[PDB]
Amino acid sequence: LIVTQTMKGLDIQKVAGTWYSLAMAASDISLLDAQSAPLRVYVEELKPTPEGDLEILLQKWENDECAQKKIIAEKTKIPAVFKIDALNENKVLVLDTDYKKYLLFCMENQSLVCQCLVRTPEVDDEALEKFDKALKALPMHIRLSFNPTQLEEQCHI
Amino acid sequence: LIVTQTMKGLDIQKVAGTWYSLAMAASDISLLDAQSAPLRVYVEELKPTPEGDLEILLQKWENDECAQKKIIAEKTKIPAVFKIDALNENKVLVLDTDYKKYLLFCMENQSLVCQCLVRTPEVDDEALEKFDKALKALPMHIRLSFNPTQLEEQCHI
Numbered sequence A, B: 001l002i003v004t005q006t007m008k009g010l011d012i013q014k015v016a017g018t019w020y021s022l023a024m025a026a027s028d029i030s031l032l033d034a035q036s037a038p039l040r041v042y043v044e045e046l047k048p049t050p051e052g053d054l055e056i057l058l059q060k061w062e063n064d065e066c067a068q069k070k071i072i073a074e075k076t077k078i079p080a081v082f083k084i085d086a087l088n089e090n091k092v093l094v095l096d097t098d099y100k101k102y103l104l105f106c107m108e109n110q111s112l113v114c115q116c117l118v119r120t121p122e123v124d125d126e127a128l129e130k131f132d133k134a135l136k137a138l139p140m141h142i143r144l145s146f147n148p149t150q151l152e153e154q155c156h157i
């Protein structure tokens, strides 16, 4: 685990609802460079299941269209870590959140993509600061940020 | 002028020689997102002419190849500002340099791309810090960084 900032005392029930992918960063440029890059995903809403698992609704650009996609991140013994059903099991870590404004997460395989999630389609400076802090610690090579207009569009167009 | 950090007392003669485009940032994602993006340029060497003008050698990915390109930035009454012969005259500003390790520059039209230039193919943390500082002041939405291996390749491949 490259990332070892996780949220202590996370209540996954309290992250339900709508989120905006305000900023994203990754360890390798090609993880995010193209609109159809594998890990360029835009989070729509988080749905924590009754048994503490986490279902994610997101949009992803795929073969010349902005696709709707659903993902279930299964819980682990660590509250801030979940595992996804990809070819390789790869983890989602929740680094920090105040539930009502921002959530920082990363997902990892060697590879790593992190996002600053926000509740509203606005530029939350403090959240972006918290994101930048969590990140200096990590080997990121691409960083993207979106304005309020792009945040209201499918696939941040 | 969005950017109003310029170097005081710049000696353009002392920026001659070889440079590495270690990091780049721009106000709009699409300025840098594709390998063939208009302002995704890799600086090879700077050649200040005798009358204080500045000739730039760079590489740019163009129609499935890494092209060699030459640009002359003409001097102005401001030592840290030069103008380029594009459809629109658009400025290059030198924000900071210690001549022997790093140079920060931006070029602007509304639009803006900035780079952290380094002398050697290494990751200069302090230079990257100076770049990050100069940047918080500016409305950047894409940031890229390259490792020593990519720095020795044509077009940072």
Ligand SMILES: CCCCCCCCCCCC[N+](C)(C)C
Binding pocket: A038, A039, A041, A043, A056, A071, A073, A086, A092, A093, A094, A103, A105, A107
């Ligand atoms: C707490 C925040 C959790 C949000 C989780 C976001 C994970 C999305 C992973 C994309 C799936 C990868 N893919 C498509 C290549 C298989």
Ligand SMILES: CCCCCCCCCCCC[N+](C)(C)C
Binding pocket: B038, B039, B041, B043, B056, B071, B073, B086, B092, B093, B094, B103, B105, B107
């Ligand atoms: C002091 C450092 C100065 C380096 C100057 C770099 C400017 C390159 C501008 C690319 C030309 C734009 N283009 C190709 C779209 C017409």
